[PDB]
Design a protein around this ligand. Structure first.
Ligand SMILES: Nc1ncnc2c1ncn2[C@@H]1O[C@H](COP(=O)(O)OP(=O)(O)O)[C@@H](O)[C@H]1O
Ligand SMILES: [Mg+2]
Lengths: 340, 191, 191, 191
């Protein structure tokens, strides 16, 4: 109950590796949000307005993880609804109502739980700029600020529809705004081309290191988002790119680190899973070029472990499997101590 | 033919010409003989970029063999009149009217390439008429010559007498020689 | 007439001229005599592609009978300044200035077709005036000649004395001959 | 004036010129004297079609009285380098470069209309200068003459001694005569 922002930060830090800026923002944000649901006394202090957050980070930065991990600290219904599916009324496509509908399915159709729920609408950037654009934004505007639910009944007339007010729920929004770096580059040192220009470092996961630190509402409006929409979300969180230095600190440090999980499965048979410092770094580089980041580690690792994971059980007396940098690439095979 | 490029902005995909795309990044191209028509386009570009952001710097590439003195003066006076600093990066060659604009850039923002050549010579003029008319025009061109020498002395910092002697005849200066002379501040080699 | 082409991208269909479509692939074409106007386009194109992907290589096809030395220097100096590797694939012919750009490509990325002729000749200059002007304009055309000889010796690796001897008269070199000379890295025949 | 054409694709209606519409079907047109600018368009078209479909054949229609040798070689070398088989169809005249590009098509894909006329002559050249320069250029034009004869022999199968004998003077060959000679494979009469 109402854990201190610092405690939340430490718990979230267990998995997240290097999101301090957003960590604090997200921590304080939820902390005060639930204090409003808690501070319901009648002392002329119910007027308090919620403040929705707008998480902007390159794909795979850790946005979803923060939302999901934080949901567990709350121990209440949480959901993630994509923004692409939603389309303005009058044309085929998901209706804004549906967001509440699916959200309530996780809540078990409990009004108290609904009001104390958190949303993580993703890919908000997609709906930028007659249909699938401003229309969706206009509809969403009312929904995020204030609206009554119309969720039809489950299982089993038209009056059966249930209602709940969308003025308590914290509607967090996560989006990978492709091109925002150029908008923020126009703020100062607009030069992209020329000898004395700010030409991008590279076309790898180094580009957006701290490019969103200087994100202002004006840029988001220029991006295409409605001015009103940008106003609705006052807080704007920023995430890093999870580059090679991050990926090296994310393959063993996290409590859920792939190496740890893989080691657990290997430990059962009796093989002491081992990794070399350079070996782990090698995987990071391979994931960055592949552009799969976080999601590329598992696959990459499975391509380097599964091979010997089908052998190890049939082999006996195995004591260790040393994974060398060479093994990561397609040159060598996992070194294994066949006997003791 | 001028190639076409696509910005691919968040708003939507728009087609810009190679020159306009660079113009968006505060880059103005000065190519060919200087004349009233081309020079006014540079003036218009500078004024347009001024309103967008008077604080941000404007880049101006100069590769020209010279031309009209009056046309060039409008560019020089416009660069100083506007608030933002107009950086200059000489590519190729730089003749008398060309080098008077390169030296008119903000201090510390004047550059040139390794194989660039900068030349400075007396103003060229011509006229046909009576003796009285010749005497009038002769004084005007002579007066104009003094102003150009003073401009170079102000930016370069060299004595006015030295500028006159060097400008008496054609003098070619390389990137290294220009830095010592004061025409520029740095010679770009690699990124 | 220049035929149009459609990319048929996922975002939608856009019409690009035959030259603009290839520009998206980091390809630049140098055709005709070298001059300030055409050379400036190559400069803008090279710089523009640097921002999109400063790591991906660039392919510069050269088919030109030569031209302005100053215009060519802006291209060579620009290719070396930028970070991306600028590949060269000589198609047709490559005269004195064209050969210099072909030799200025990145190491191991210089190519030429089988029936390609690469000629090297001294810089061409013309000037009229008094003896003092002739003496002044003679050192410039002689100093430039030294810079071009050093550039070829640097990329080709041959000693400076050999470059001066060969550049004295027109020397036509085929694909195979140019490889031994160091002007190029490989002669491509079939994919 | 070039007329407009509507494709009326399933996705929607599009407007393409008569030449661009045919380019979609892997067809390239060679009209007029061969020169660097028009030849560069053909090269660009050949490469673009290669990326779209490197397996589908390409049809190159040739109607030209000849032109620059260098420009023609850039096309010939490009046709052989790419993977797709570049067909060739004479539509009435090929004097010097048209027959080299008509005979440089994939085997079994060289056609000619019923009343087309094909000629072959040695490359004409013009140059002036000192005796030493003339001797250098004379060797170059003699080397080119040999390389061109070798190309015809390879594609036609005739011995080099016959090609050189037939190229000394202008030799006109009809559609039927060309098939026996080896310049083409089939004469298209009706569909
Ligand atoms: N620092 C991290 N530690 C562990 N897992 C991470 C980290 N960053 C990202 N991930 C993984 O990446 C996946 C993608 O989620 P996220 O990066 O939040 O946004 P997106 O889903 O848009 O890529 C998550 O399932 C998560 O497990
Ligand atoms: Mg995720």
């Amino acid at each position: 109950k109402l854990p201190a922002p610092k405690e939340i930060r430490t718990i979230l830090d267990q998995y997240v590796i290097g999101q301090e800026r957003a960590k604090k923002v997200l921590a304080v944000a939820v902390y005060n949000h639930y204090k409003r649901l808690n501070q319901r006394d009648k002392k002329d202090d119910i007027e308090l307005g919620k403040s929705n957050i707008l998480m902007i980070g390159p794909t795979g930065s850790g946005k979803t993880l923060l939302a999901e991990t934080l949901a567990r600290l709350l121990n209440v219904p949480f959901t993630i609804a994509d923004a692409t599916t939603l389309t303005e009324a009058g044309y085929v496509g998901e209706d804004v109502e549906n967001i509440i509908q699916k959200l309530l399915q996780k809540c078990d159709y409990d009004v108290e739980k609904a009001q104390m729920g958190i949303v993580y609408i993703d890919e908000i950037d997609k709906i930028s700029r007659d249909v699938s654009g401003e229309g969706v934004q206009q509809a969403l505007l009312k929904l995020i600020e204030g609206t009554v639910a119309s969720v039809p009944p489950q299982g089993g007339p038209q009056q059966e529809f249930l209602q709940v007010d969308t003025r308590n729920i914290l509607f967090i929004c996560g989006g990978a705004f492709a091109g925002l770096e150029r908008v923020i580059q126009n703020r100062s040192a607009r030069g992209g081309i020329g000898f004395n220009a700010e030409v991008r470092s590279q076309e790898m996961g180094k580009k957006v290191g701290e490019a969103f630190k200087e994100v202002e509402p004006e840029d988001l409006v220029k991006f295409g988002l409605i001015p009103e929409f940008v106003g609705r979300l006052p807080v704007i969180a920023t995430l890093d790119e999870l580059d090679e230095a991050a990926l090296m600190q994310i393959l063993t440090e996290p409590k859920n680190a792939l190496t740890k999980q893989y080691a657990k499965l290997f430990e059962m048979e009796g093989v002491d899973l081992e990794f070399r410092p350079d070996a782990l770094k090698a995987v990071a580089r391979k994931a960055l070029e592949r552009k799969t980041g976080a999601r590329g580690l598992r696959s990459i690792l499975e391509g380097i472990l599964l091979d010997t994971m089908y052998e190890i059980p049939s082999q006996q007396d195995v004591s260790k499997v040393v994974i060398d940098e060479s093994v990561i690439d397609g040159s060598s095979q996992p070194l294994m101590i066949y006997e003791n | 033919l001028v190639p076409m490029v696509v910005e691919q902005s968040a708003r939507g995909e728009r087609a810009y010409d190679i020159y306009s795309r660079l113009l968006k990044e505060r880059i103005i191209f000065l190519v060919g003989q200087v004349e009233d028509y081309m020079a006014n386009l540079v003036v218009a570009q500078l004024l347009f970029l001024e309103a967008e952001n008077p604080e941000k710097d404007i880049h101006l590439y100069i590769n020209s063999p010279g031309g009209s003195v009056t046309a060039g003066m409008s560019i020089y006076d416009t660069m100083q009149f506007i608030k933002p600093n107009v950086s200059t990066t000489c590519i190729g060659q730089a003749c008398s009217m060309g080098a008077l604009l390169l030296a008119g850039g903000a201090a510390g923002k004047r550059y040139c390439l390794p194989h660039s050549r900068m030349m400075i010579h007396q103003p060229l003029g011509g006229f046909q008429g009576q003796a009285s008319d010749i005497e009038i025009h002769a004084k005007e061109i002579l007066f104009i010559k003094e102003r150009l020498n003073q401009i170079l002395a102000h930016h370069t910092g060299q004595p006015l007498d030295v500028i006159a002697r060097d400008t008496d005849r054609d003098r070619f200066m390389s990137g290294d020689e220009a830095v010592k002379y004061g025409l520029i501040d740095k010679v770009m080699t690699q990124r």
